[PDB]
Design an enzyme around this catalytic site. Structure first.
Site, PDB file in Angstrom:
ATOM      1  N   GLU A  35       1.621  -9.419  10.446  1.00 36.76           N
ATOM      2  CA  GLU A  35       0.999  -8.480   9.453  1.00 36.76           C
ATOM      3  C   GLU A  35      -0.449  -8.177   9.845  1.00 36.76           C
ATOM      4  OE1 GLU A  35       2.475  -6.686   7.515  1.00 36.76           O
ATOM      5  OE2 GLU A  35       4.272  -7.736   6.691  1.00 36.76           O
ATOM      6  N   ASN A  46      -0.294   3.324   4.319  1.00 40.54           N
ATOM      7  CA  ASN A  46       1.161   3.619   4.262  1.00 40.54           C
ATOM      8  C   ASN A  46       1.395   5.128   4.110  1.00 40.54           C
ATOM      9  OD1 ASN A  46       1.155   0.718   2.207  1.00 40.54           O
ATOM     10  ND2 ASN A  46       1.935   0.782   4.320  1.00 40.54           N
ATOM     11  N   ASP A  48       3.121   6.673   1.997  1.00 46.87           N
ATOM     12  CA  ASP A  48       3.151   7.120   0.575  1.00 46.87           C
ATOM     13  C   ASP A  48       1.742   7.306  -0.003  1.00 46.87           C
ATOM     14  OD1 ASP A  48       2.511   4.518   0.033  1.00 46.87           O
ATOM     15  OD2 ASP A  48       4.094   4.140  -1.419  1.00 46.87           O
ATOM     16  N   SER A  50      -0.385   4.651  -0.340  1.00 43.39           N
ATOM     17  CA  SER A  50      -0.854   3.291  -0.695  1.00 43.39           C
ATOM     18  C   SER A  50      -1.437   2.712   0.604  1.00 43.39           C
ATOM     19  CB  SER A  50       0.263   2.433  -1.243  1.00 43.39           C
ATOM     20  OG  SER A  50       1.219   2.227  -0.236  1.00 43.39           O
ATOM     21  N   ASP A  52      -2.127  -1.305   2.596  1.00 43.21           N
ATOM     22  CA  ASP A  52      -1.871  -2.764   2.708  1.00 43.21           C
ATOM     23  C   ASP A  52      -3.162  -3.512   3.069  1.00 43.21           C
ATOM     24  OD1 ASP A  52       0.906  -2.241   2.454  1.00 43.21           O
ATOM     25  OD2 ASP A  52       1.295  -2.494   4.610  1.00 43.21           O
ATOM     26  N   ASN A  59       0.309  -4.713  -0.836  1.00 46.93           N
ATOM     27  CA  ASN A  59       0.276  -3.245  -1.012  1.00 46.93           C
ATOM     28  C   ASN A  59      -0.361  -2.847  -2.348  1.00 46.93           C
ATOM     29  OD1 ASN A  59       2.061  -0.618  -1.760  1.00 46.93           O
ATOM     30  ND2 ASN A  59       1.566  -0.637   0.421  1.00 46.93           N
TER      31      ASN A  59
END
Ligand code: NA
Ligand code: NA
Ligand SMILES: [Rh+]
Ligand SMILES: [Rh+]
Length: 129
Positions: A35, A46, A48, A50, A52, A59
């Protein structure tokens, strides 16, 4: 803060992740490696809208408020910036709520694709724990 492998393993164990929801410590270390490369400051956008955040790439769609993710939730009741601290408390406590949400560590696409079904004990080999 960029953790060493064993230093992060010890911090995760001290914060209650070893066998949390049945996930051995190596699972959590493996997830953090793929990660964030063990970097608390890691951020990634992301598709969409959003973002992380932090060592476990938590998220803003569901877990934290970053002030810029519309129609989202803040189920960990924290600012996303909390997830970037050298102190992994907020990331750990929020990870425990995520992994309890029904899909286990499959919530972390990197864990399902890079750690699930592998020899994850290798991630804690040689560490004093
Ligand atoms: Na990721
Ligand atoms: Na949010
Ligand atoms: Rh701590
Ligand atoms: Rh020990």
């Amino acid at each position: 803060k960029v953790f060493g492998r064993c230093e992060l393993a010890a911090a995760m164990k001290r914060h209650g992740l070893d066998n949390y929801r049945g996930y051995s410590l190596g699972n959590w270390v493996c997830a953090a490696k793929f990660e964030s490369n063990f970097n608390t400051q890691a951020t990634n956008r992301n598709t969409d809208g959003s973002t992380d955040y932090g060592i476990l790439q938590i998220n803003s769609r569901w877990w934290c408020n970053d002030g810029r993710t519309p129609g989202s939730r803040n189920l960990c009741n924290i600012p996303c910036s909390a997830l970037l601290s050298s102190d992994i408390t907020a990331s750990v406590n929020c990870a425990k709520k995520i992994v309890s949400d029904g899909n286990g560590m499959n919530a972390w696409v990197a864990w399902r694709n890079r750690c699930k079904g592998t020899d994850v004990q290798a991630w804690i080999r040689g560490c004093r724990l």
